[PDB]
């Protein structure tokens, strides 16, 4: 709340920031202070024009495609006429010859694994630290702890050990084993001991022994060979390891001791500045920047009380290996980092640069400049930058969201080589992971590769923002249907296997990741089991998962499913056609009884509500938000976009008056008090709703929703915050 700027050449950098980089972040780099800044300067300086000219271009052609529908009221649906205009205004571009990705420098988790890739906000450091040790994680816990276990019939959880329910737990990894890595001739059910014997698995029975089928699977062991303490095998690139102990507490209730089956999971994890997150400001990009910092040099600590404990980072994991020697794997998730993308600017630098007047900085540069600075420390192990490090191979790591078209994905990779510039590392090294979740992106993806076709590590469909920029871009078209029928459209269908086919015509498999969208219902993890499954039948080799728990469990479906051999199955078809991806889901005529009008726009109101109280009042970027149908949903700003430009187009075309909206507001703004009512930091926003600046930032999000660029939340939400912070203050 005390300006208090430090002059760097053109920019006023905020002390706690310019400290934090100084004190912090540079010593280890070998990086001179002067000369970064000066890079800092010279960057920001160089490349804020082209950002400003992209984000005109945004306005022009929607503005454009607003005025096209506007000509139209009465005319019918003309997907030629439409077509052809879209290309002449340049908004759908001529698709390249085929080619190939030829990035090189990447890790094999990214290349040739597939498995879970969990997202988690910055932030929160006792989440990151949790995520990046989710890599490992506990099949027995995460099936006690779910409902992949019924608690019926006497199988509740409680909070110490039910037998009734860890037996099931017990049976059901029996069951998994049987499947994943299965003996010759027998069951891990009637298995009563291991050993090994000759460099290879055997497993006691009740009067015989048996081998795996496939001996290949055996990765390795820890304790004697005689007498193991626990067996690491491997299917279809992932780890299990049982843990063998016959005097804990499971494995002596266990017919061969086992204690836990262990599942690699979380291969991949993306810690998050976007849309998990709320940071407005210098103080808040700073608390950002300092846990990516702990994360790069490994000693990010903090003291977790549920007694009192000092969560840290996992070391590796050693065994001997199955004929003898040291086995070593990475302990931790490999860490992507997700940048802001090109939008907004952050006024924790302020630049004179060129008739400037003080403005702030664009955050996405910022973002590759300080998160790119910072990653030097996870490809270095020495005392200076920590001993943990990240990167086995010499890469870091970016995700870059909500881009709009080749031009904007070329505009990254230029931030990223002159970053690297000032930073002094080889050109390549940032690389990048390209969301496919704005509609101009999917339709002109195979360029959009193209531009990054040196840097690029994924491409992954976001499904909940390009249902967001669907129902913007097509705002004047007419009214749009209800939001939990998008799941079954022409258009979305059609994005989700173009951009498998696109991916896979550009080279992706052994290369690159393709990836899938997050699943919402955090405890709705049986139902998750059921058909998340989908994703690796697809041909992904990755999709988002909102929990530790729930990788371990998505972790299955990659036993389950050879996504290697699905991708090759899929290689050289076109399973789509444009004009699919143009097919607007416009509502039909006389679509809705009033009641299910009246359940849309509450569902819509309490769920904004609910993400938007804890997002102004306390600066949580993701929380957990029961829906109409009590259905408890992670809530983010893509997820909110849906929500309002929603109710915003319901509004523009006269479904519903803004009198309707309001009156919802009001009726279900008590409804989120009362959910939080526990929560001792919650301040109500009933009765007093025009007083609580939370109130007022949902309604601004749902009444002006029309006109926020692309449909974008983050102008009213940024504003509105400051305004609380200011406040409270
Ligand atoms: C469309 C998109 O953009 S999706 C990508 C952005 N989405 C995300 O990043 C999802 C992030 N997920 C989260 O923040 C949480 O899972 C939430 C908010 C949904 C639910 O968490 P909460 O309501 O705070 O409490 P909950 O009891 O369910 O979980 C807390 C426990 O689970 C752990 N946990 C929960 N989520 C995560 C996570 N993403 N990563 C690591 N650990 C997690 C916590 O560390 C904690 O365990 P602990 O006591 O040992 O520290
Ligand atoms: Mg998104």
Redesign the pocket.
Known sequence: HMTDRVSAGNLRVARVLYDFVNNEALPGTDIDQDSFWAGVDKVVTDLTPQNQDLLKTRDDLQAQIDKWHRHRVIEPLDPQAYREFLTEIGYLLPAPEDFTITTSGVDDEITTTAGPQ????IL?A??????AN?RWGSLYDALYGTDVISESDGAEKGRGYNKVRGDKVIAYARQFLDDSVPLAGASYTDATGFKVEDGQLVVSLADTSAALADPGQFAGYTGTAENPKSILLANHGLHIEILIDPESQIGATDGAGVKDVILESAIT??M?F???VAAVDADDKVLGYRNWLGLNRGDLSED?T?KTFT?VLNTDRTYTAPHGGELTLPGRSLLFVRNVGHLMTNDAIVSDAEGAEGAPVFEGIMDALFTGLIAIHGLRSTDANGLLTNSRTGSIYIVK?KMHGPAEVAFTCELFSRVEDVLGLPQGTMKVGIMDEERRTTLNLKACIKAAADRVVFINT????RTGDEIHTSMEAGPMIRKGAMKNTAWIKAYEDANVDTGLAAGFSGKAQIGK??W?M?ELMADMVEQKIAQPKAGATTA?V????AATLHAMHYHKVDVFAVQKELQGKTRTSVDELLTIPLAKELAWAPEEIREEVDNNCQSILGYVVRWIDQGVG???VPDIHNVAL??????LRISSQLLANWLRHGVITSEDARASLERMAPLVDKQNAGDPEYHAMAPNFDDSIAFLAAQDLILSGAQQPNGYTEPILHRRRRELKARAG
Do not use: H, Q
Not at 462 to 465: I, N, R, S, V
Not at 546 to 549: K, N, V, Y
């Open positions: 969990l997202v988690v906000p929160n006792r989440f990151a630290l949790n995520a989710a994890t993306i998050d976007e849309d998990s977790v549920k969560r969201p976001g499904f909940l923002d969208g997050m919402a955090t988002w909102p929990s530790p728990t993701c929380s957990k992670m809530e983010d700003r893509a997820t």
